[PDB]
Paper text:
α-l-Arabinofuranosidases from glycoside hydrolase family 51 use a stereochemically retaining hydrolytic mechanism to liberate nonreducing terminal α-l-arabinofuranose residues from plant polysaccharides such as arabinoxylan and arabinan. Here, the crystallization and structural characterization of MgGH51, an industrially relevant GH51 α-l-arabinofuranosidase cloned from Meripilus giganteus, are reported. As in other GH51 enzymes, the N- and C-termini of the sequence are found in the 12-stranded β-sandwich domain, but unlike bacterial GH51 enzymes MgGH51 has a 169-residue ten-stranded β-sandwich domain inserted following the 36-residue N-terminal strand.
Using this chemical biology approach, we aimed to determine the structure of a fungal GH51 enzyme, identify its key catalytic residues and compare the catalytic sites and mechanisms of fungal and bacterial GH51 enzymes. To this end, we have crystallized MgGH51 and solved its structure in the unliganded state and in complex with l-arabinose, AraDNJ, α-l-AraAZI and α-l-AraCS. Clear density was present for the primary amine or sulfate group on C6 resulting from the ring-opening addition reaction. While the steric bulk of the sulfate group of α-l-AraCS caused some rearrangement of the active site, the addition of α-l-AraAZI to Glu429, leaving a primary amine in place of the sulfate, caused no apparent changes to the protein structure relative to the unliganded enzyme, suggesting that this structure is a good mimic for the natural glycosyl-enzyme intermediate. Crystal soaks with arabinose, 1,4-dideoxy-1,4-imino-l-arabinitol and two cyclophellitol-derived arabinose mimics reveal a conserved catalytic site and conformational itinerary between fungal and bacterial GH51 α-l-arabino­furanosidases.
Author numbering: 1 to 627
Write the structure that this text describes.
Amino acid sequence: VTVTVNKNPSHTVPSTLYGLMFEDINHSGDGGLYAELLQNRAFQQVTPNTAAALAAWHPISNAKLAVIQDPSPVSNALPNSLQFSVPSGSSGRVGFTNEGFWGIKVDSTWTYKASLFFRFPTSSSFSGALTVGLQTNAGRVLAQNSTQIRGTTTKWTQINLELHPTASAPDVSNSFFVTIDGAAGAGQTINFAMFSLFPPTFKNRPNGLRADIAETLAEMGPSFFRFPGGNNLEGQTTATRWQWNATVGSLLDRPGRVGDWGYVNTDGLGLLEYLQFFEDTGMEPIMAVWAGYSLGGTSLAENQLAPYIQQAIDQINFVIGDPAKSAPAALRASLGHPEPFTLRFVEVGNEDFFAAGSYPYRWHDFVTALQAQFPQIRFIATTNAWNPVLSPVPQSYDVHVYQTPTWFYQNAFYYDGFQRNGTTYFEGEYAAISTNANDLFGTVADGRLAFPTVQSATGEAAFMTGLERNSDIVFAASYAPLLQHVNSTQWTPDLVSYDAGSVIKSTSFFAQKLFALNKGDQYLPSTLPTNGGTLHWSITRASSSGKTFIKIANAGSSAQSLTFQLTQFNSVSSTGTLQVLTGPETASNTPEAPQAIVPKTSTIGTGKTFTYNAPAFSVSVITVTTN
Ligand SMILES: *[C@@H]1O[C@H](CO)[C@@H](O[C@@H]2O[C@H](CO)[C@@H](O[C@@H]3O[C@H](CO)[C@@H](O)[C@H](O)[C@@H]3O)[C@H](O)[C@H]2NC(C)=O)[C@H](O)[C@H]1NC(C)=O
Ligand SMILES: *[C@@H]1O[C@H](CO)[C@@H](O[C@@H]2O[C@H](CO)[C@@H](O)[C@H](O)[C@H]2NC(C)=O)[C@H](O)[C@H]1NC(C)=O
Ligand SMILES: *[C@@H]1O[C@H](CO)[C@@H](O[C@@H]2O[C@H](CO)[C@@H](O)[C@H](O)[C@H]2NC(C)=O)[C@H](O)[C@H]1NC(C)=O
Ligand SMILES: *[C@@H]1O[C@H](CO)[C@@H](O[C@@H]2O[C@H](CO)[C@@H](O)[C@H](O)[C@H]2NC(C)=O)[C@H](O)[C@H]1NC(C)=O
Ligand SMILES: [NH3+][C@H]1C[C@H](O)[C@@H](O)[C@@H]1CO
Ligand SMILES: [Cl-]
């Protein structure tokens, strides 16, 4: 195909076109992006005196453990304590371990910060060392530190100890431990609460993020971060919905919540940590507010919304409010951030096409109130575009699609036929999730992708050329889900996978990165791809530099020749860079082969005419300079 490139831009490419969609799913938050290494660190939202309350916790030797509703809890928000008892006649090492989130990476190049709260519920003459550390799951101690404690300490007391491993572990099958001498400790009971183990964090943030994952997200050059969901916003009931104010302040004062993916959320990754991450990466938020529906099917009645609307106002005021004008904005100031954060976009609910009978009145009451308080914010509707008809008229819709790789290349013209009437579209969730048109959400045996493939990434890339061409009305687009803990998966495929030790960048990750890092501010119209065909392209240009980014998706099994004609330009560089992602159709980056498929960079000859053979199942970026 001959592709003629127009020198005259048709529109300015939004700064927000490519970004991330985050919720705590697959332990993407707890166990993932949030750097905390202990699972069930504070016994949040578990039933006392049950086995599930002790999840991730194990005795050392003859230790007696129970999670109790503490008669004098460490805080209002943390009613549960770990009751540790050493039997009469004990000796040696007695204590307990935390298995982490399916392991703990123990690296001698890291300093870890261990902390816990303890008290003796009954004053005693105990005198001895409390030792914390890291061991292999064989009991081989790799790091340890101790401090003197006394049975006369009946008031909650925090212990803060650094850990320095003497050796890196050969694998992640390691645990955190707390021990006392069994002879010195015989017959003693100690109550513990609010444990924590942190490695070094991204940007050395207090209560920050896991470095390799954070760096992987920053690597992709995202412009926005949509959060906190997704289904994880909604709750299963009104009472279990995400609430901003429960995620701010001291860890002692965050009660956690049962999330929407089968596990408890600590809310240690809370609103301020999200906003700090955005400051650290140059992302802007697309922030969702809860809109009167939860996943058990309950809509709030129109006459029940007012307190929930005010809570959404409170949440936005925490982000952007003048600290002199509201309690939430004053709280942001008090937590060390007097300056408002950026927030341009708020999403009203999540996937309210599941509650389209109530969304009209929910949308109406929420957006009337929020637009009056926040005249500069753009509010995004979550129902199917224009069905049902909403009032006020939404400025933006969030469009989600999970489909086959083929569907994505076949639907790259999805936005071309849309009216240009001031409405903008957010592709807030998309992914090629299955090769089975009949059972998209089924099993891997029935065609569900365990990981993105070259096929899925190239189909997505074709659809993304459509998003970029239509970026006069498409303002933002994010793959979902973003993150996967390979030991605790509720949804595949995912953009970035990891275990306790290392990260896997998917084929789809590299497509997302290639699109986002090679994006100018001018859209240059070109010869249209065949609507329904496997071969798609989109061309942008950086007005400041003349760097010109030709993105080519070949989502099919046939190599296809493209001849670019740039005769309209005064000058085209005599060379360009090629970046190409390609491989076998069903090839994946897996834990076993995490670098099977990676992009390759080369130099090609360019000018006003050049020819590129786009391989079967390839994503290609050619960068030239044009003036
Ligand atoms: C986060 O902030 C929300 C407010 O936006 C807090 O929710 C509010 O909590 C109060 C106190 O529990 C609720 O008032 C109570 O309602 C019950 C049931 O009708 C009543 O029996 C009590 O006498 C009292 O009036 C209020 O309804 C509730 N509001 C909403 C919108 O949920 C929430 O507690 C805060 N969370 C934390 C951890 O601080
Ligand atoms: C045990 O942990 C303590 C507490 O973190 C470590 O002592 C701290 O070390 C850092 C770095 O030198 C100092 O800046 C802190 O002021 C120290 N605090 C205290 C209370 O001493 C100590 O080095 C750790 N020991 C081992 C063997 O890992
Ligand atoms: C923008 O144009 C869209 C088409 O891209 C219009 O959508 C129609 O909206 C009415 C109700 O307002 C629906 O009953 C139709 O079914 C919609 N058409 C389609 C194809 O979905 C939309 O109303 C326009 N919006 C504005 C602000 O003018
Ligand atoms: C977490 O998941 C990883 C990756 O799937 C597991 O490690 C794999 O285990 C399988 C099945 O035993 C082996 O055949 C693979 O070779 C392992 N892969 C790698 C890269 O090591 C790991 O066992 C899981 N951890 C836990 C505690 O379940
Ligand atoms: N079904 C998806 C849509 C929903 O909002 C998310 O929580 C799910 C995984 O990305
Ligand atoms: Cl397919």
